[PDB]
Design a protein around this ligand. Structure first.
Ligand code: HC4
Length: 125
């Protein structure tokens, strides 16, 4: 397991250093999106929660295709606001329920160090 806690203050720095196998070693789900919501990275822990194949969701749109329950002011709205302001860093509870059993989670969204890149981190609650 990679030695990284969900919600860490410097999580973006740690993950900037990681390859795919490393991201798959995290204790929590990790998705990297571009500013339009297209899926750049998706780790094994996230697929364990959602039943999505991390190898195949890459390239799809998280808000339009994969996770319509997040296409809402409460999730997508916060993403959009943080992308626009340039300082995305927000945490909230949510329920994921499209093509998976309804699952309560805690979500942390945070701007990545690489350009036009934004993390969505997920753990069960
Ligand atoms: C609601 O439709 C949420 C769906 C979902 C959330 C997170 C994922 O990684 C995959 C699907």
């Amino acid at each position: 397991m990679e030695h990284v806690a969900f919600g860490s203050e410097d999580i973006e720095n740690t993950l900037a250093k990681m390859d795919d196998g490393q991201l798959d070693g995290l204790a929590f789900g990790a998705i990297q999106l571009d500013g339009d919501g297209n899926i750049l990275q998706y780790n094994a822990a996230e697929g364990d929660i959602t039943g999505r194949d991390p190898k195949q969701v890459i390239g799809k749109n998280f808000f339009k295709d994969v996770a319509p329950c997040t296409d809402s002011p409460e999730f997508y709205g916060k993403f959009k606001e943080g992308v626009a302001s340039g300082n995305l860093n927000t945490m909230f509870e949510y329920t994921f329920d499209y093509q998976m059993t309804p699952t309560k989670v805690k979500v942390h969204m945070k701007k990545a160090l690489s350009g036009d890149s934004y993390w969505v981190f997920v753990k069960r609650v």
